[PDB]
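Sample 1 of the test manifest.
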Amino acid sequence: GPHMATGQDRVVALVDMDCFFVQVEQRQNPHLRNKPCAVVQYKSWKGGGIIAVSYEARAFGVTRSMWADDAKKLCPDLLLAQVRESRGKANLTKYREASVEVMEIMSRFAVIERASIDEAYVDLTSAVQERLQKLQGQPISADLLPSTYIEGLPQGPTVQKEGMRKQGLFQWLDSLQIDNLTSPDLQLTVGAVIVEEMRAAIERETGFQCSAGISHNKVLAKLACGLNKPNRQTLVSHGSVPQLFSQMPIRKIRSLGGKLGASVIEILGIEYMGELTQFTESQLQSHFGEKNGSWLYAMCRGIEHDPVKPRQLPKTIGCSKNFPGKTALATREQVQWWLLQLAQELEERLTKDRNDNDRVATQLVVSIRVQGDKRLSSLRRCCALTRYDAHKMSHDAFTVIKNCNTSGIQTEWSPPLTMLFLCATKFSAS
DNA sequence: ATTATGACGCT
DNA sequence: AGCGTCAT
Ligand SMILES: Nc1ncnc2c1ncn2[C@H]1C[C@H](O)[C@@H](COP(=O)(O)OP(=O)(O)OP(=O)(O)O)O1
Ligand SMILES: [Mn+2]
Ligand SMILES: [Mn+2]
């Protein structure tokens, strides 16, 4: 009853760019705008691999991970933009720099947690409190929420999507008690007003559109974000959770998309997030461990406490390349040349990072994969990163891996390497 | 031959 | 530390 926490203490948003790498390429090249188009890396093997798809192209069935030649079978007029290649490898710098553009705009409104190259969480609790005093018990006009969906509405007592959106929004606003400065629903609404403003700023100042979710925690905010994409934002209230979760596959919730989620389904014989409410906390802890069990018990009730961490910059800087099938590295000279290529891109990014962000990495992590293994990584070894010098870093990387070579022969490498990875970690201020 | 990343958990 | 999981 009165002592039962409801996880309504915070206002959290998740802002996620719409078909991000595609929009970066469409800003650069106007011919690609408002077209079925995708971003591809490499070209020689089956037209290259698709890593981003415009909403026009999705309508034809084009998806991420599809080969471009296969995508063209679904969409013959599909337009393609290629990822830049430097030192023999895909180079994602243009998209990292576009990410920074967006992150710096978001940071003007609130402290953000960078969650990926194209999304960040926002803790809006304080900003909401401030806007609420500005408002002075003034009602929130629908005009302040021109792209917002209220999940679960309209309900009860109609043909257009925008018409439905506004119907739901009006039901929501009509019910709001604006007199209470601590009503969670009011706080979420004001949160949504601020995110409309954030999203307008991102679009005005970069040309990029995005979607967003507004709720009381990160997991619900992310789920909300995807409910109405592209170019829209969705408010998921605490009250909307039982209906929303009653038909929500468990795999849809962040962190449950893999083996744990499959185990929840198999062991408990359920399909939907809401079905978890029928287990005790101890029951869930018995199956899934103390931490997961407690997390699941609260999460299926819409409650989660993971903070929006104040971190805008990535914690690691890495450079990775696969060498699939017959391209696998089988000579020492091969392995050394590619370590140098990776090390050279790493040095470039590290040096820029040091100038921009007043920090220095102190540890170099080296990872490889060997033909036959189908783990992502076969071996991970660390060494000291004492200077930003590609020749030194690549020599050091070779040193820490060179005894993986089963070859009795100096010059040959066996088994061949199907992946190399250099990652700079453990930053210190400088 | 679903690539290039990047965060966090376990022991 | 080195490995595994989950993510975009
Ligand atoms: N598995 C991947 N491999 C390589 N790059 C990826 C992968 N997933 C995502 N990316 C890149 C390209 C994406 O444009 C960008 C953002 O990813 P994501 O938010 O999942 O989709 P998206 O922004 O392209 O479309 P949308 O978010 O509108 O569905 O990150
Ligand atoms: Mn996105
Ligand atoms: Mn994303």
